[PDB]
Design an enzyme around this catalytic site. Structure first.
Site, PDB file in Angstrom:
ATOM      1  N   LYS A  36      -4.267  -3.932  19.629  1.00 45.22           N
ATOM      2  CA  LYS A  36      -4.852  -5.149  20.185  1.00 45.22           C
ATOM      3  C   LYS A  36      -4.129  -6.417  19.749  1.00 45.22           C
ATOM      4  CE  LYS A  36      -8.087  -3.106  22.480  1.00 45.22           C
ATOM      5  NZ  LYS A  36      -7.635  -1.698  22.656  1.00 45.22           N
ATOM      6  N   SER A  41      -9.449   7.197  17.101  1.00 43.89           N
ATOM      7  CA  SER A  41      -8.914   7.430  18.442  1.00 43.89           C
ATOM      8  C   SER A  41      -7.527   8.053  18.385  1.00 43.89           C
ATOM      9  CB  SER A  41      -8.890   6.115  19.234  1.00 43.89           C
ATOM     10  OG  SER A  41      -7.973   5.194  18.654  1.00 43.89           O
TER      11      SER A  41
HETATM   12  C1  LIG Z   1      -8.173  -0.659  22.160  1.00 42.61           C
HETATM   13  O1  LIG Z   1      -8.427  -1.748  21.632  1.00 42.61           O
HETATM   14  C2  LIG Z   1      -8.150   0.581  21.339  1.00 42.61           C
HETATM   15  C3  LIG Z   1      -7.969   1.811  21.968  1.00 42.61           C
HETATM   16  C4  LIG Z   1      -7.741   1.936  23.458  1.00 42.61           C
HETATM   17  O2  LIG Z   1      -6.646   1.211  23.948  1.00 42.61           O
HETATM   18  P1  LIG Z   1      -6.805   0.576  25.409  1.00 42.61           P
HETATM   19  O3  LIG Z   1      -7.837  -0.512  25.316  1.00 42.61           O
HETATM   20  O4  LIG Z   1      -7.280   1.674  26.344  1.00 42.61           O
HETATM   21  O5  LIG Z   1      -5.467   0.056  25.793  1.00 42.61           O
HETATM   22  C5  LIG Z   1      -8.050   2.968  21.227  1.00 42.61           C
HETATM   23  N1  LIG Z   1      -8.295   2.917  19.878  1.00 42.61           N
HETATM   24  C6  LIG Z   1      -8.469   1.716  19.248  1.00 42.61           C
HETATM   25  C7  LIG Z   1      -8.727   1.716  17.774  1.00 42.61           C
HETATM   26  C8  LIG Z   1      -8.400   0.540  19.974  1.00 42.61           C
HETATM   27  O6  LIG Z   1      -8.582  -0.649  19.325  1.00 42.61           O
END
Ligand SMILES: *C(=O)c1c(COP(=O)(O)O)cnc(C)c1O
Ligand SMILES: *C(=O)c1c(COP(=O)(O)O)cnc(C)c1O
Lengths: 336, 335
Positions: free
Chosen positions: A56, A278
């Site tokens: 981000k 994630s």
């Molecule tokens: C997004 O802020 C974010 C994601 C997913 O990325 P996209 O928003 O789909 O581009 C996955 N994991 C974390 C920790 C994030 O902050």
């Protein structure tokens, strides 16, 4: 031998100029499994290397930068977003350097550590009642936008094309670092800016690149299943976002919350990379991809959106797998 | 005309290959003060860009790597260190990738978050008696080494020349990134590996480089004052370390704990860099350096050893400065 990093040969003018250009690293420990052929290459892109340690950074920077360039953000105006996660951090970092106030709306009891990070950057936190949850935050946000229609610039993280556009750089970095060899890109979906932005920009250069989107098995809305509760922080927004374009995505791989966490623990133990929740989901989807017979020898690139240190307040590293590496990888990768 | 980062144009074989090569960044927000001439350059080296976000990534890596190459760490042996901070993290990261067991001795009194990161890397935490504090950790550490002499390789962070030697890279990065313009190097002192290693290796290329050591005003032992309690985590060990070489250091600047914290808060608010506690001390010493009349026009490089996110459980960001940038900088820089 082992060659560590070389000098960047640059004096950056401010912290925003260090955003991006993140490393692409081979996995070895968690790829040591019979399901994955030895000539298949599984690479992780470490967005934790951004100055505030998540993907981000790119999004908050480009949303604000483009708005300033376009005249949509002008002196006297303030940025606003409803977020309890990394988007708030990325907006606060860029806002502090560009010199704009940033208002973040969140429930008072949500991610108190991220609250502290954002407040340290000078954010004005708008804390809705903890008892009311995120609906209370959305309600407070909408009330604020109606009370300040011209003063506030809404980041609109789930719909803003300047989110997606940040990933021209992400994609170019993958293209250059792999010398055009990238075959599959795996991205867990929050706003969908990464999967759509990287997918679209890689496919312009190489039409056959496969785009794999990852979502929680417990809230697999891209697969057409109902929203549900899950624990993979950062993804699984519970709706199909305005940025999402199904025609860019070739495969949706759902990942169970508990498997994402177990994968993240295995990656730090056996590859020494402390990635977030994630990232565990994305890596497991990528390792399953690396086990398919038609993918032998391919170059599979997996986005790791942030660092596990941001999750020490959870039990991500309290739970302990008793088994050996092979027991853990068998439990995750065996189709049976 | 903002130019963001360009591609690394590299596939790293493992996470250890991402260590070092950290960014050198101009300060602007906290340098906007009448005491600092506009042609003086104040640059910060962001060691938070290491994969586990501190300068000790370099130290843990080189201590283990060199011991393997020299045969002092042999397969079957295990790494041991007594530490509760970044040194343990750097050792655990390198141990996990090189495939050697890592034993970190610390009191069970330390909070889980400290132990949590290290055990995530597969480290064996040897928790000493929580009541006996740090002395108990050393007691258990010396007992382990004495009872299994051939088993353990001791990292010896306060005396190991492979600590200091890691900073041949740190220095070369500063030398190349500034095209040899670096005039002053400012380093807050923990093990002293950074101030001595960077100081020695810059002076080999440019004899006139001034080396500034920074220590807590409350525990200013490099200046000959007594050990005492302070809150600048990462520095102020309370003794003069075996690595420390007084001849390399040209000036020792003491910084009060509360001033270091206030500086760290100002840097993140006004420059958007979320540096740690020892970084606040180093930057304040560097800004005072930047105010000296004989330093007009010089290039001042300040090591920032880690990030403030590692200190969210502390009081670093509790106090809020109500005043403006000028009020805050006046309170730190005026006499
Ligand atoms: C997004 O802020 C974010 C994601 C997913 O990325 P996209 O928003 O789909 O581009 C996955 N994991 C974390 C920790 C994030 O902050
Ligand atoms: C060291 O680990 C450290 C220092 C001091 O560096 P040296 O040991 O003197 O090279 C300063 N600040 C932090 C956070 C550290 O971890």
């Amino acid at each position: 031998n082992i060659t560590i990093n070389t000098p960047r040969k640059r004096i950056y003018h401010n912290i925003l100029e260090t955003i991006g250009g993140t490393p692409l690293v081979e996995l070895h420990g968690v790829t040591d499994h019979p399901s994955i052929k030895k000539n298949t290459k599984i690479l992780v892109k470490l967005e934790c290397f951004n100055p505030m340690s998540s993907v981000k950074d790119r999004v908050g920077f480009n949303i604000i930068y483009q708005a300033i360039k376009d005249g949509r953000l002008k002196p006297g105006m303030e940025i606003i977003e409803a977020t309890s996660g990394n988007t708030g951090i990325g907006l606060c970092q860029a806002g502090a350097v560009f010199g704009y106030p940033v208002n973040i709306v969140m429930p008072s009891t949500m991610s108190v550590e991220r609250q502290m990070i954002m407040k340290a950057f000078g954010a004005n936190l708008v804390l809705s009642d903890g008892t009311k949850g995120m609906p209370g935050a959305i309600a407070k946000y909408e009330e604020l936008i109606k009370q300040h229609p011209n003063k506030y610039f809404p980041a609109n993280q789930f719909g803003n094309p300047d989110n997606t556009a940040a990933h021209v750089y992400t994609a170019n970095e993958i293209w250059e670092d792999t010398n055009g060899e990238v075959d599959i890109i795996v991205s867990a979906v929050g706003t969908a800016g990464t999967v759509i932005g990287v997918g679209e920009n890689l496919k312009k250069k190489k039409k056959g690149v496969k785009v794999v989107a990852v979502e929680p098995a417990e809230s697999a809305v891209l697969s057409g299943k109902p929203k549900g509760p899950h624990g993979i922080q950062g993804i699984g927004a519970g709706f199909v976002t305005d940025i999402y374009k199904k025609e860019v995505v070739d495969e949706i791989t759902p990942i169970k919350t508990q498997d994402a966490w177990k994968m993240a623990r295995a990656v730090v133990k056996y590859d020494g990379i402390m990635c977030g929740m994630s990232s565990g989901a994305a890596i497991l989807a990528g390792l399953k991809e690396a086990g398919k017979v038609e993918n032998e020898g391919k170059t599979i690139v997996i986005i790791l959106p942030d660092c596990g240190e941001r999750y020490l307040s959870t039990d991500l590293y309290k739970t302990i797998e008793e088994g050996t590496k092979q027991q853990v990888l068998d439990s995750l990768l065996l189709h049976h």
